[PDB]
Amino acid sequence: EEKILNREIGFAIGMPVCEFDMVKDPEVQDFRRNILNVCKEAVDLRDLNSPHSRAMYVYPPNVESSPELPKHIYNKLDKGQIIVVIWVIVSPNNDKQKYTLKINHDCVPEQVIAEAIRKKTRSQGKYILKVCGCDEYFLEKYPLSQYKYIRSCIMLGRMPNLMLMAKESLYSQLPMDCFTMPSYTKSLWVINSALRIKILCATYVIDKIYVRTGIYHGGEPLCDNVNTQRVPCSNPRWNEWLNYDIYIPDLPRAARLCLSICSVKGRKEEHCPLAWGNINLFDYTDTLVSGKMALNLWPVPHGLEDLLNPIGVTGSNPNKETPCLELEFDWFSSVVKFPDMSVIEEHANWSVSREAGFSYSHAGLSNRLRENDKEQLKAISTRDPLSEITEQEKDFLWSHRHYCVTIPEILPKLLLSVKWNSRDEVAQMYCLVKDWPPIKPEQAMELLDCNYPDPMVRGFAVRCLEKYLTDDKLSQYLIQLVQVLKYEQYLDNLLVRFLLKKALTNQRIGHFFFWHLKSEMHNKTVSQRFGLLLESYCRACGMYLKHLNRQVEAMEKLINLTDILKQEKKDETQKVQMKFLVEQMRRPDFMDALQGFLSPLNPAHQLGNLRLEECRIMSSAKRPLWLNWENPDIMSELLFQNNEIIFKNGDDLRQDMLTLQIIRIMENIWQNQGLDLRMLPYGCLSIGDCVGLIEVVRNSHTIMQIQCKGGLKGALQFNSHTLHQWLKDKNKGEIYDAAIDLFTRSCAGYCVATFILGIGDRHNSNIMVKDDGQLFHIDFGHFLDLTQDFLIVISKGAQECTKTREFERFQEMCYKAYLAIRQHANLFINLFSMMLGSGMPELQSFDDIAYIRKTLALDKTEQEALEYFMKQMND
Numbered sequence: 001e002e003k004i005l006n007r008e009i010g011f012a013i014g015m016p017v018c019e020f021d022m023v024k025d026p027e028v029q030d031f032r033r034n035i036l037n038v039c040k041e042a043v044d045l046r047d048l049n050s051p052h053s054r055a056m057y058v059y060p061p062n063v064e065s066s067p068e069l070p071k072h073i074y075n076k077l078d079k080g081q082i083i084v085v086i087w088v089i090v091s092p093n094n095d096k097q098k099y100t101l102k103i104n105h106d107c108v109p110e111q112v113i114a115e116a117i118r119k120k121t122r123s124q125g126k127y128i129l130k131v132c133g134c135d136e137y138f139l140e141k142y143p144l145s146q147y148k149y150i151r152s153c154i155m156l157g158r159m160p161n162l163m164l165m166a167k168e169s170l171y172s173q174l175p176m177d178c179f180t181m182p183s184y185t186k187s188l189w190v191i192n193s194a195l196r197i198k199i200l201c202a203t204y205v206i207d208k209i210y211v212r213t214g215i216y217h218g219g220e221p222l223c224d225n226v227n228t229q230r231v232p233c234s235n236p237r238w239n240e241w242l243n244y245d246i247y248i249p250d251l252p253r254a255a256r257l258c259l260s261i262c263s264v265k266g267r268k269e270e271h272c273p274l275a276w277g278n279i280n281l282f283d284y285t286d287t288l289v290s291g292k293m294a295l296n297l298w299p300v301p302h303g304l305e306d307l308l309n310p311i312g313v314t315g316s317n318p319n320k321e322t323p324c325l326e327l328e329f330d331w332f333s334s335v336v337k338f339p340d341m342s343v344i345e346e347h348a349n350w351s352v353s354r355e356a357g358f359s360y361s362h363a364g365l366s367n368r369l370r371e372n373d374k375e376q377l378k379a380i381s382t383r384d385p386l387s388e389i390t391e392q393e394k395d396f397l398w399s400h401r402h403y404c405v406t407i408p409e410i411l412p413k414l415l416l417s418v419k420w421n422s423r424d425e426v427a428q429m430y431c432l433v434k435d436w437p438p439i440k441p442e443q444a445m446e447l448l449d450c451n452y453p454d455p456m457v458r459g460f461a462v463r464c465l466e467k468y469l470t471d472d473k474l475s476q477y478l479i480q481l482v483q484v485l486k487y488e489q490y491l492d493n494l495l496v497r498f499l500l501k502k503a504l505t506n507q508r509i510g511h512f513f514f515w516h517l518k519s520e521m522h523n524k525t526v527s528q529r530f531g532l533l534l535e536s537y538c539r540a541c542g543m544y545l546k547h548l549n550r551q552v553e554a555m556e557k558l559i560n561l562t563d564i565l566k567q568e569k570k571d572e573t574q575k576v577q578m579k580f581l582v583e584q585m586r587r588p589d590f591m592d593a594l595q596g597f598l599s600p601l602n603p604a605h606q607l608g609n610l611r612l613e614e615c616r617i618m619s620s621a622k623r624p625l626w627l628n629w630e631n632p633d634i635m636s637e638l639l640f641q642n643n644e645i646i647f648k649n650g651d652d653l654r655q656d657m658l659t660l661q662i663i664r665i666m667e668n669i670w671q672n673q674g675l676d677l678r679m680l681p682y683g684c685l686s687i688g689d690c691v692g693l694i695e696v697v698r699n700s701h702t703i704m705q706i707q708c709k710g711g712l713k714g715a716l717q718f719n720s721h722t723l724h725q726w727l728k729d730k731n732k733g734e735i736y737d738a739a740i741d742l743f744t745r746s747c748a749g750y751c752v753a754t755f756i757l758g759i760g761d762r763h764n765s766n767i768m769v770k771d772d773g774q775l776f777h778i779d780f781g782h783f784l785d786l787t788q789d790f791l792i793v794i795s796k797g798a799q800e801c802t803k804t805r806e807f808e809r810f811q812e813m814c815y816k817a818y819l820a821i822r823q824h825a826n827l828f829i830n831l832f833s834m835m836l837g838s839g840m841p842e843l844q845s846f847d848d849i850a851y852i853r854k855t856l857a858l859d860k861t862e863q864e865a866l867e868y869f870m871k872q873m874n875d
Ligand SMILES: CC(C)(C)OC(=O)N1CC[C@](C)(N2CCc3c(-c4cnc(N)nc4)nc(N4CCOCC4)nc32)C1
Pocket: 620, 646, 648, 651, 653, 656, 682, 694, 695, 696, 697, 698, 700, 701, 702, 765, 778, 779, 780
């Protein structure tokens, strides 16, 4: 009953559910109970129009956000019409019969079905369309071309193959979801005292040692940092009150105490942080902290480059056998609470009245209290998220804060201009935020990074997402939204409720939401937040938990298998290693585990029997596994008969994930702007700590393999004409011009992309080509830091390739692609900035992201940046 569900949830998270019941923290227990309304709401949405609504949850329509087709996509159609193949399975022999239609691109699925019934009968509401080869359905009345599969077929010039299926055949396979509810003052503003914190002593701990402290709002100090006196190592007792230059009523809601135990060496003094810890000055119930408190510290993360870690996670280290700092806060003879919104609202009105009479009767000059000014506000509004905003500009923005509500896009600049250590300014900012006009999701996401910790600011950003973020765009930005959950002060927040609700009403989002959280469960700084979020997801996702457990079981077996191969049988032959794999595959636990589950790279792909004869232990770095499964779909032949995936144990696949996501976003920018630059963002998913899956691109070869004619030629005898000749043999005739054009467009896209992103390495073994001419890159080891062979293909064989008309057309493609991404720089700056909490070695500070500002030449004019890019291309 509930014991079965708790066992399944425990296996999915990799933690028994009873371990959450043992947690004494009232915030943990309140999260577990209070989040359940999000679960109830999602389940009710799924039962509204059951079984159609249940079918839409399990198989959501995979559509683009807009039915409007870019002019170059509409041109690929035949006078606005598409040719589709509709297949029917005629029982008993289960024969596949096809019916070819020529219909308007914007025909809804029921119109297509009716037209297929007409063509079939020439020799209605009881049927649905499915994509041949995978579990993707057309259950909603969107125009056919808006479905990503159809849109993808229009571009690429492939013919859509759809399968007609009885509506009842699908609805009968949807089991009944069993969501069951589980078994489980004074005001801050009347305290007229300055903030002081006592550092008592440290347990579980170079010349001397001290405690470095600071009051922060985000990564910004609200006052000067204050240190304790230096003491010899030993078990240091300080018993020292640290006094801060800030008054208790001026503490913002998101104010934090950031601590460090620092080391001093005498040589120039060398200071090093030994351990760190951050504390929210207010708890989840708005209570100001008081009395004695002990904090277990965390190890210093690699690449800290400062004595404190204000961006770091909040709360005590769960491992209690670590450096433990004892602190004491003042007790104001009562439980002190942050004021209600109505109290803050009254003070904001009284502040606007006081700071108006102060303007008239104040003898001094107050920089914080015309058409040239409106143009200066408009120019500041257009600066990128990493551009510096001076103290004079902050005074300018804050003084015109009411004019700012008319350029809603300026909100991030204005929020940075507020004096967060002044309750008079903050109360006024809350009122402006409360009625601020909504902004576009790509702009609201900026307000969810580490720079904006305020709950009202973050609440506004989430409300913009609830109103304007489509499920397509939510899927596209999922990795960032799951990462910014780490910046939230508390377990229960508006962002977590938005993401969970979305995950629980769209199973495609729920699948990736599960894996982005599960993959970080090894990280103790997020284990509890992500584990509690995972329990609430698993409790309400329905039958999909049974499928997720099968994916988890396959991945655990592959980690175990690859662990034995990398450790115990490392130097044994690939034949002897494959004999071990075939022996492990004869064991029932492994036979079940590595077969008959959905692909974690794309749950629409079923993975049937493991085809060991087509598998191999690769000789590449970290010895990955090349795996091959049968696609058990009734029409697998129309998509792919076998699914090939690389399972790698040892590489941090997060940088590859991020690069592949960015390439996808760049391609959408280009496609929407009428720039057909074909990219290949293949699937890559981090499954855990340096473990993951990579999608194998069918019909691909490295430049190295093409160049050495499969072993005959050696590097010393490498002709720069070989690549072009190989492409001509693979595409003879009219299909040759298409291959050269596809090669040109894809090569242009990758030249610009790798340039802007600063992708290193780049050689004949990490650059690949498909039979049809499509060029792509693999293995993006690092980021934020065009051979003669390609020019010969682009110029169709000419020796003076940099002088042909084809090279001028390729150059224009690159310039337009570069300018299109420069126009969307804030989005890319924001996507990188939101990842600053992952702990990726090549993305640790805003200085790393500033590399994009240089390649995009954001401090120049449009014509000055194009000339910079032309100089880089010519060099
Ligand atoms: C049979 C073909 C010609 C396809 O492959 C071959 O013969 N190769 C011989 C070795 C080879 C280069 N290996 C080595 C590493 C590798 C990776 C890879 C590995 N680690 C990260 N982090 N990221 C990507 N990815 C792919 N890709 C296959 C194509 O689809 C995209 C993914 N191949 C790879 C493939």
